[PDB]
């Protein structure tokens, strides 16, 4: 593969200097149209051989283009904040917003390449990292990103003449082969000649940029639930107390330091999600948990890919994050109301699975709740809530809108559990016509999941 | 001062339980209306004696109220990100947005009291911390925050009968804590943000008392010639093409070397750029960046605030961009917008910009004190040169230049910027952070002066360091 860019690629001064006058003006214009459209981000990965012009070329691009609209990152030295969270988290944090450009040195490729070359991970684990990168980039691109990957190359003999290489290019070749895609190709740019390497990257950027700017029943599950299940006065008191003490104990366990906890709550309107969350929080000191109620995305969230808004709330080791509503919004209300396109929610299922697998692989304990009531129970709770003198309990116009689409929600939850209840992250369906049963089942599920993790730790 | 809350306040079980039923419903309703209005934040500070029911009480509030709408923080285990930035940054980072509540343990008071009681800081530095708190709280409340401060108390005798870094078993610990607590509380209890001293010996009294204070406070809140500095510039100054290229080259090398110097590890750099439209800020900024690798700097072009910035007090948007140690942040437009464009267009009230000068100075002092090098440029051009530049922009086919609908209007507001730049310079050109007026009619002169100033400021800083 690499021998194409070992053929001595070169550009003379006169040709290059004329090229550059027009290239830099054309980039500034495109960069400005990128800002004005505010429609998609540009991500440039900078990898390859040390001394093949990586840093020099990025410097030159910030002289040709406007650095006020470009952020350059390296991920050499992670902070404790970054290290105490899943490895993908640090990249999400620095993704450039729509209309801006982010240049990443020291990205996910450098990490996986030097880890294999330095021998800290096996062949199998590199293949996993290659396939994770492809799914990550496909999502970023599916979300609208314009993604450029540049590999700056010297040959073994070219490198030596500039006053680990072998296995580095051996493994590099495998990665590049398996992550060069029509939607996000690798551009191998020979770095021997500094005019060629800079003009070639400039031109590929301009081309790709100009081009991007010129563009425009499933009821089985829920029907099978025994919603008649309940706990009586004594069962509730005792079991609530036992499982609350059990939760406080598990989190207080030293082994919780190697883990964290994410609990997702979804369910029908008036199913009792808030009260179920409160019986969990009742077990703990509030410095032990972070509740995120998920609403319509804010401006800054809308400027980023879908999952950015959730990754930003992922807990550090020893923390507990509760999502009241979650990333499943996309396969629920967004699907039903048309806040995203069908192709968007269809790909979400696998993107969500990929997300939860990232979390799980790092040691985050993921539990997911769908609190299910029948339609008649919803109507009764809606009635009860209306006749209280509490403004918080008012049934809104949106509440009635959602209830009207009851059957669309049944089908959507069916599809969701079919496509995202995984071995790594199962869906727990909570029978919730009786709040007492629902509240204890939530606590017991969290606790079993934590115990399960401590056992798996060996 | 604490003797009021040493008399032994109690509430009986039955009176308590009755009151709580009502109180929790009224709290929940107040919390919901707060979310609905989305107009201001609620901040609750939790402080006082070990064993006085601080944590117990905050837990109970999260049973009474909806915890989904409350963030509970503590600040005495800073991360790398927090430790490499000025001490105040970490609090700004966790402020709750409008319509939410944040409850702070280990806040700025715990920090200053612990530091003094342990002998880490001297009397003068405690007094400074006290005043910084008063000023910080004032600004937050001026911006709209509802700020509660609770001091949970026990007497020495009550403590005696009853994880903090202080050893409360030592008699001296309590005595000194309460001695300094008195001085802190007297100085920082204000009509717009009182301290509430709550006796903590009785669980029922302490929880109910705090909850009642919160309800009351929340219900109430839910119901509601400086032109001679510019006229005296000599805008006739310039640099010849040859003098420019040598000097530009010399100053770029000097900057690269100063940034690479080991002494920069103790520091960071902030460069602020303001000036007339078409004054050439972009160009000056790029001749600085041309000197360095892009991994060495971060440029922030300041525009209209985003949604998440609008939900927070004014300086929050700027604090979020302050550099860690060894970093260099360039602000293309800055927090000075408040006393420039906002003042002029009326995007904020006269009270808001008048208080901004002191606020800005306090901000810049916080940065200086941590070792951040702050450089501030006003690029000055005349009306005649502006117009030449407005024509040259549009003369060119390139549509990034086209002079927009608005900055033909701003040009008819020229003497309003003169008056405003004058006031700004008078009120915020301090010993700690002076303003540099750049005579900018000649781009070449302007560019070299910007670079030279940055370089003079870094060298100066090194000369001040040990």
From Swiss-Prot, chain B:
Changing residue 274 to A: Strong decrease in activity. Changing residue 386 to A: Strong decrease in activity. Gene3D superfamilies: P-loop containing nucleotide triphosphate hydrolases (3.40.50.300). This is Polyphosphate:AMP phosphotransferase. Optimum pH is 8.0-9.5. The lineage of its organism: Bacteria, Pseudomonadati, Pseudomonadota, Gammaproteobacteria, Pseudomonadales. Signal peptide: none annotated. It is an enzyme of class 2 (transferase). One of its GO terms (molecular function) is kinase activity. Changing residue 393 to A: Almost loss of activity. Its cofactor is Mg(2+). Uses inorganic polyphosphate (polyP) as a donor to convert AMP to ADP. Can also convert GMP to GDP, with lower efficiency. Cannot dephosphorylate ADP in the presence of polyP. Contains 2 fused PPK2 domains. The N-terminal domain seems to be catalytically inactive and might be responsible for the protein dimerization. Its EC number is 2.7.4.33. It catalyses: [phosphate](n) + ADP = [phosphate](n+1) + AMP. One of its GO terms (biological process) is polyphosphate metabolic process.
């Amino acid at each position: 593969m690499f021998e194409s860019a070992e053929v001595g690629h070169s550009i003379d001064k006169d040709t290059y200097e004329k090229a550059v006058i027009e290239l830099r003006e054309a980039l500034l214009e495109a960069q400005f149209e990128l800002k004005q459209q505010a429609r998609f981000p540009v991500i440039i990965l900078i990898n390859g051989i040390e001394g093949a012009g990586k840093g020099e070329t990025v410097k030159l691009l910030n002289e040709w283009m406007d650095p006020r609209l470009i952020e350059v990152q390296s991920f050499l030295r992670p902070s404790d904040e970054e290290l105490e969270r899943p490895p993908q988290w640090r990249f999400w944090r620095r993704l450039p917003p729509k209309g801006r450009t982010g240049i990443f040195f020291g990205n996910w490729y450098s990490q996986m390449l030097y880890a294999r070359v330095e021998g800290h991970i096996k062949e199998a684990k590199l293949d996993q990292a290659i396939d994770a990168a492809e799914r990550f980039e496909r999502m970023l691109c599916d979300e609208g990103a314009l993604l450029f990957k540049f590999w700056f190359h010297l040959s073994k003999k070219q490198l030596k003449e500039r006053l680990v290489y072998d296995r580095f290019v051996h493994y590099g070749e495998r990665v590049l082969r398996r992550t060069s895609r029509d939607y996000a190709p690798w551009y191998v740019v020979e770095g021997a000649d500094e005019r060629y390497r800079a003009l070639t990257v400039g031109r590929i950027l301009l081309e790709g940029l100009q081009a991007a700017l010129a563009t425009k029943d499933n009821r089985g599950l829920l029907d099978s639930l025994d919603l008649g299940q309940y706990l009586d006065k004594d069962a509730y008191k005792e079991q609530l107390a036992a499982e609350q003490a059990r939760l406080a104990g598990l989190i207080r366990d030293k082994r919780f330091r190697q883990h964290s906890l994410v609990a997702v709550f979804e369910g029908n309107d008036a199913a009792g999600k808030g009260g179920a969350i409160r019986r969990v929080t009742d077990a703990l000191d509030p410095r032990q948990y972070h509740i995120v109620p998920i609403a319509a995305p804010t401006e800054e969230e809308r400027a980023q890919p879908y999952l950015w808004r959730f990754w930003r709330h992922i807990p550090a080791r020893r923390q507990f994050t509760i999502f009241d509503r979650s990333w499943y919004g996309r396969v629920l209300v967004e699907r039903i109301e048309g806040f995203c396109a069908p192709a968007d929610w269809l790909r979400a299922y696998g993107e969500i699975n990929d997300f939860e697998e990232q979390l799980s692989e790092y040691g985050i304990i993921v539990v997911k709740f769908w609190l299910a009531i029948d339609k008649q129970t919803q109507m009764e709770r809606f009635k009860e809530r209306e006749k209280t003198p509490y403004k918080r309990y008012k049934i809104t116009e949106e509440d009635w809108r959602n209830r009207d689409k009851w059957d669309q929600y049944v089908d959507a939850v069916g599809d969701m559990v079919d496509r995202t209840s995984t071995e790594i992250a199962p869906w727990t369906l909570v029978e919730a016509n009786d709040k007492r049963f629902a509240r204890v089942k939530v606590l017991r599920t969290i606790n079993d999941a934590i115990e399960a993790a401590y056992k798996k730790d060996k």
